[PDB]
Amino acid sequence: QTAPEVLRQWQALAEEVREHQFRYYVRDAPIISDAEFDELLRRLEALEEQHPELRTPDSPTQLVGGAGFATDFEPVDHLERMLSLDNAFTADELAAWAGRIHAEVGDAAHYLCELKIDGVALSLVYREGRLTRASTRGDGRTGEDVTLNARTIADVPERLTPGDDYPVPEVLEVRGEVFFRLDDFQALNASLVEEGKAPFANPRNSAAGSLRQKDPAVTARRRLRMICHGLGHVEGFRPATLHQAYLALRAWGLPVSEHTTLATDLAGVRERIDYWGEHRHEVDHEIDGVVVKVDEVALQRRLGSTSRAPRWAIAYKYPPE
Numbered sequence: 001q002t003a004p005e006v007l008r009q010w011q012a013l014a015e016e017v018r019e020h021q022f023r024y025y026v027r028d029a030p031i032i033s034d035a036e037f038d039e040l041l042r043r044l045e046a047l048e049e050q051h052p053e054l055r056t057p058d059s060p061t062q063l064v065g066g067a068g069f070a071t072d073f074e075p076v077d078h079l080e081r082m083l084s085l086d087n088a089f090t091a092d093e094l095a096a097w098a099g100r101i102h103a104e105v106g107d108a109a110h111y112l113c114e115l116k117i118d119g120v121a122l123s124l125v126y127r128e129g130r131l132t133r134a135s136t137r138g139d140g141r142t143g144e145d146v147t148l149n150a151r152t153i154a155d156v157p158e159r160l161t162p163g164d165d166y167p168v169p170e171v172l173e174v175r176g177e178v179f180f181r182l183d184d185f186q187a188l189n190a191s192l193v194e195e196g197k198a199p200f201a202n203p204r205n206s207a208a209g210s211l212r213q214k215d216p217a218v219t220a221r222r223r224l225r226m227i228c229h230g231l232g233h234v235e236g237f238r239p240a241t242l243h244q245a246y247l248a249l250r251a252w253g254l255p256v257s258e259h260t261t262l263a264t265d266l267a268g269v270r271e272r273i274d275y276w277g278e279h280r281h282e283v284d285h286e287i288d289g290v291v292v293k294v295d296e297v298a299l300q301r302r303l304g305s306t307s308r309a310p311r312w313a314i315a316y317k318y319p320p321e
């Protein structure tokens with residue numbers, strides 16, 4: 001032994017054991033063989049005999065066979081402020097946003113165009129390629145902890161994948177939208193009603209509810225999705241543009257949309273807006289608009305942000321009906 005190696009070993013093993021208890025109980029998705037887990041738990045037990053100081057009421061072995069997994073929505077701070085978006089509902093407004101952008105920067109700004117998803121915003125933090133925290137927006141500075149619930153979403157990976165061109169960052173704060181596809185929204189409503197529960201009025205309400213469960217196992221059996229669409233605080237990653245950032249996200253395994261395009265001027269922005277006004281109904285989830293961002297990171301830095309919103313992006317919202 002070495003007391004430092006004792007501690008090292010314990011932590012690692014408890015971490016591995018706790019992760020598997022989560023996969024087996026909270027989700028129904030074990031990733032090792034049913035037999036392999038048993039050795040691990042023995043060892044950890046085997047491990048706390050020698051060193052009884054290690055066994056605590058919070059240890060994977062004692063006091064948590066089956067349980068200890070609950071969400072309490074406690075406040076957690078975002079690394080970088082998570083601002084909301086300013087909206088534009090009319091063509092002049094967008095033109096006016098674009099004019100002002102072109103009074104500050106020139107033709108150097110290109111516009112990334114994405115489909116705005118009407119769901120629940122989620123913020124994930126990855127430390128050394130491992131998911132450590134998932135959070136709701138809250139007030140922009142502080143959100144609620146729903147890490148366990150996010151851990152059940154299929155679209156969200158626990159770990160990031162080692163890129164060739166893209167090395168995993170030391171810290172990555174990534175933002176996205178959590179949502180249901182239409183068919184699954186309906187399906188869940190049926191199931192709920194089948195157990196004498198009230199159904200959800202819309203898919204956004206349904207996703208929010210499904211995410212916010214005190215028992216995350218509930219969340220695991222609901223077909224929630226996620227698309228990433230923004231970055232917060234990052235270390236070890238310095239992308240020149242947002243479009244290029246999406247390439248690294250993809251490489252690492254984060255979910256990204258396939259409907260993003262890059263436009264060079266307002267005319268190009270206008271075509272996408274018009275196009276999706278006519279084609280948004282064909283997407284399988286709710287799109288309530290198009291978000292237009294300035295693609296260059298350095299240009300978004302110069303433009304900055306106000307207390308409530310960024311000045312380098314704007315969301316064009318369509319008529320409700």
Ligand SMILES: Cc1ccc(CNC(=O)c2ccc[nH]2)cc1
Pocket residue numbers: 020021023024025030031032033034035037
């Ligand atoms: C693959 C995998 C991962 C995690 C676990 C956790 N615990 C148990 O299954 C269990 C409880 C009682 C008997 N067995 C199992 C299997």
